[PDB]
Amino acid sequence: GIVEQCCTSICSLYQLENYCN
Amino acid sequence: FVNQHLCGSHLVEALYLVCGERGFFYTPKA
């Protein structure tokens, strides 16, 4: 999930945009 | 500003700034 990819590990714009509507 | 550890309200803020008018979905337990 987003926590595993952006909190416990370093986030990225690619990852963040996957969560935009 | 997105290339770092973003947790909790910090992560929610990042999504808010990046997604804009598109909005987003926050699913912590995924």
CA-based nearest residue to A20, from B15, B12, B8: B15
Determine the distance in angstroms separating the CA of A15 from the nearest CA of chain B, rounded to an integer. 10
Cα-based distances in Å from B26 to A6, A8, B13, B14, B21: 12, 16, 11, 11, 15
CB contact under 8 A, B24 and A19: yes
Instruction: Report domain extents, chain B.
Output: 1-30
Determine the distance in angstroms separating the CA of A2 from the nearest CA of chain B, rounded to an integer. 7
CA-based nearest residue to B14, from A8, A17, A4, A1: A17
Q: How was this structure determined?
A: X-ray
Backbone φ and ψ for B24, nearest 5 degrees, come out as: -165, 175
Q: A1-21 b/e with 16+ CB inside 10 Å = b?
A: ebbebbbeeebeeeebeebee
Cα Rg of chain A, angstroms: 8
In this complex, is the C-beta atom of A14 within 8 Å of any C-beta atom belonging to chain B?
Answer: no
Q: How far apart are the first and last CA of chain B?
A: 24
Q: How far apart are CA B10 and CA B19, in angstroms?
A: 14
